[PDB]
Amino acid sequence: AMGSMERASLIQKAKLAEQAERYEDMAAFMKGAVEKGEELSCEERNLLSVAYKNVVGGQRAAWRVLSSIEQKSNGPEVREYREKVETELQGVCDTVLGLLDSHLIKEAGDAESRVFYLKMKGDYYRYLAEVATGDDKKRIIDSARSAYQEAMDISKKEMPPTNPIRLGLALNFSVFHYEIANSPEEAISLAKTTFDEAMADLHTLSEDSYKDSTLIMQLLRDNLTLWT
């Protein structure tokens, strides 16, 4: 449905929809921009990420409320409506995974872009894993694992330890370990190594870079405090 709108108009309207807190419209404008087939700039990558994080964040928070109600219940209404929200959540994750696979990841040759999109692929399989059950759940967990691992390998080879994309990848992969993979020690180890390596690289940064890096380091510290 965004096929008739210019790419630059879609980007401009995504920024307006962000100002208006209309994140479903923001996601649909960024989906249309990706579908134009050109690579995304750094600014455009971040618009894409912000739009879908907020859309899925609404759905995950709802699914959590409904799942809690359902667990306490244990008529069909609670389960039906939890299933409705779950399906729409899965559809959002599938849409994002579809954009990554057609064809954002394959055309991303620079480290900053390739790590960004692989971390997104890990995050959206992780959201699928949160609602999954059984050994359907297993292949989804492994897919999230694989994406984060490929991003980590690239990030370690190609980015400094203070790069905010590298930091946020490590933060989300530590949450995957803690929340999804039942590997709290791996979680803690990753978050502590990441924090310590970044601290030792801070001296290299300008004032503005320092503020960007240390903000994500504080998120790593807040988790280690929650986890230990």
Ligand X SMILES: O=C(COc1ccccc1P(=O)(O)O)NC1CCCCC1
- Told to check if 109 binds Cl ion by CB under 5 A, we report yes
Taking the C-alpha atoms of residue 197 and residue 191, their distance in angstroms, rounded to an integer, is 10
Q: Identify residue 107 by its one-letter amino acid code.
A: E
DSSP letters for 149-196: HHHHHHHHHHS-TT-HHHHHHHHHHHHHHHHTSS-HHHHHHHHHHHHH
Q: Which of 3, 75, 76, 109 binds Mg ion (CB under 5 A)?
A: 109
Positions that interact with ligand X (CB under 6 A): 57, 60-61, 123, 171-172, 175, 219
Residue 73 as a binder of a second copy (CB under 8 A): the answer is no
Nearest to 91 by CA among 120, 122, 118, 131: 131
For the chain, count helices (H), then strands (E): 10, 0
Out of 4, 74, 77, 134, point to the residue binding a second copy (CB under 8 A).
77
Contacted entry of ligand X, a second copy, Mg ion, none for residue 57, CB cut-off 5 to 8 Å set by kind: ligand X
Tell which one of 41, 68, 69, 84 touches Cl ion (CB under 5 A). Answer: 84
- The residues near 152 (Cβ < 8 Å, ≥ 6 apart) are 169, 170, 173
- Residue 29 Cβ, how far from ligand X at the closest point, in Å? 22
Residue 204 tokens, joined: 């290299």
Q: Which entry of Cl ion, ligand X, Mg ion, none binds 86, CB below 5 to 8 A by partner kind?
A: none
- For position 17 contacting a second copy by CB under 8 A, the verdict is yes
The span from the CA of 56 to the CA of 61, in Å, is 8
Ramachandran angles phi, psi of 12, nearest 5°: -65, -45
Residue 109 or 134 having the CB closest to Mg ion: 109
d(CA 92, CA 59): 9
User: Could you tell me the smallest distance in angstroms from the CB atom of residue 210 to ligand X?
Assistant: 21
For the record, the structure tokens of 86 come out as 């779950």
Q: Is residue 103 part of the contact set for Cl ion (CB under 5 A)?
A: no
**Nearer residue to a second copy within complex by CB, 29 or 178:** 29
Query: What residue ranges bind a second copy (CB under 8 A)?
Result: 9, 12-13, 16-17, 19-22, 25, 58, 61-62, 65-66, 69, 75, 77-78, 80-81, 84-85
Query: What residue ranges bind Cl ion (CB under 5 A)?
Result: 80-81, 84, 109
Query: What residue ranges bind Mg ion (CB under 5 A)?
Result: 6, 107, 109
